[PDB]
Amino acid sequence: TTAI
Amino acid sequence: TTAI
Amino acid sequence: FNKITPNLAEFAFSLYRQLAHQSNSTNIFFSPVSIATAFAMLSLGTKADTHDEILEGLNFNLTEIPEAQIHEGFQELLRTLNQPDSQLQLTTGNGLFLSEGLKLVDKFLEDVKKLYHSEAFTVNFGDTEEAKKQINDYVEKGTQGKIVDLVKELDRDTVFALVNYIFFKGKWERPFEVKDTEEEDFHVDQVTTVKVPMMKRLGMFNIQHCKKLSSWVLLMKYLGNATAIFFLPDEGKLQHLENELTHDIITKFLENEDRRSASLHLPKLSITGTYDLKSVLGQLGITKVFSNGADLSGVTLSKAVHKAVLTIDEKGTEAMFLEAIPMSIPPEVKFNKPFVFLMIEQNTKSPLFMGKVVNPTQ
């Protein structure tokens, strides 16, 4: 759950 | 264990 | 090996140290591998400082390891992570999100697909609410429904976004009995307690007291290719424990196979960590990509978020073995005060998740  |  | 596991490890600790100081008072939970995977994949379309910062900021010394071998590292890691033993659930995916009329360097496109196994989607950033819906949908799907809302804000100008998710679900090799779970005190302070459901088990554990860390160290194996390490600091020793963790020390613990008797109390819990990666990662020398100078040119994105959720319980399944317990009195080892933990994938030895429990009912 990483968003850039 | 649940890890999300 | 993995070639980059040592680096991932060191990144996990740098990032942890930063989260710990400060808040100092908040549960901590994050996936070092999810963060590093997203930014190694990003770095691939950056150049100059912007680029260098990213890899350095991920604990790769650039005057030390060939940049290509990093990405082969990540490619092999990801491959491995997506082949769990059948009794373990483990999945990771990367997603690229692109505006219809955006000019994309073909090289970047083929790198992320090959090295990072990435999927790619066109979306209409013209409709900000709907583009968010489509992004959060990728995550909801990757996360089997558990995360519906990773992204809550999208700048109006954005035409590009990058997502990594990881999903882990595991069953203890040697589980706790639900009958034995009871409400106990958890010492949030030296003088304050809250009630928590506390699992317990008398068994033979890979457990030891380590003077270098002033902590009890417990390794708990999941069925399949993963292990959790829990660290219980001696009184007033949390900070020392936080400051002395290294890749080398953890590697040693993983090698230990001795078991001894203990009466283990471990809380049943859910915690979540949510992070603004700008402030946090800029504190680790990754500031450029966030600013105007940002050399976003190897592709043709100011906000960055991380969210992680942990749940721990007795077995991991609604669905035998026997341990020889000696006569001697077992040490009582209670995870009833702030502790640290690490989840490690077996084949790669990589740090899938790391955190601190300060208060399970926070």
Author numbering:
A (entry chain C), B (entry chain B): 2 to 5
C (entry chain A): 23 to 322, 329 to 347, 351 to 393
Task: Please quote the authors directly.
Comparison of the similarly high-resolution crystal structures of native (1.8 Å; PDB ID: 3NE447) and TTAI-saturated α1-antitrypsin shows that only β-sheet A undergoes substantial structural change. However, in solution, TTAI binding significantly perturbs the backbone chemical shifts for the majority of residues in the protein, with the exception of those within β-sheet C, which are relatively unaffected. The binding of two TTAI molecules stabilizes the protein in a ternary complex by favoring the population of compact conformers relative to more extended states such as those previously defined by IM-MS as polymerogenic intermediates.
The Z (Glu342Lys) mutation causes α1-antitrypsin, the major circulating human antiprotease, to misfold and self-associate into polymers within the endoplasmic reticulum of hepatocytes, with toxic gain-of-function effects. The concomitant deficiency of circulating protein renders lung tissue vulnerable to destructive and proinflammatory effects of neutrophil elastase, that is the physiological target of α1-antitrypsin, and hence a clinical association with early-onset emphysema. It proceeds from a metastable native state, via an unstable monomeric intermediate state that is polymerogenic (M*), to a hyperstable polymer assembly.
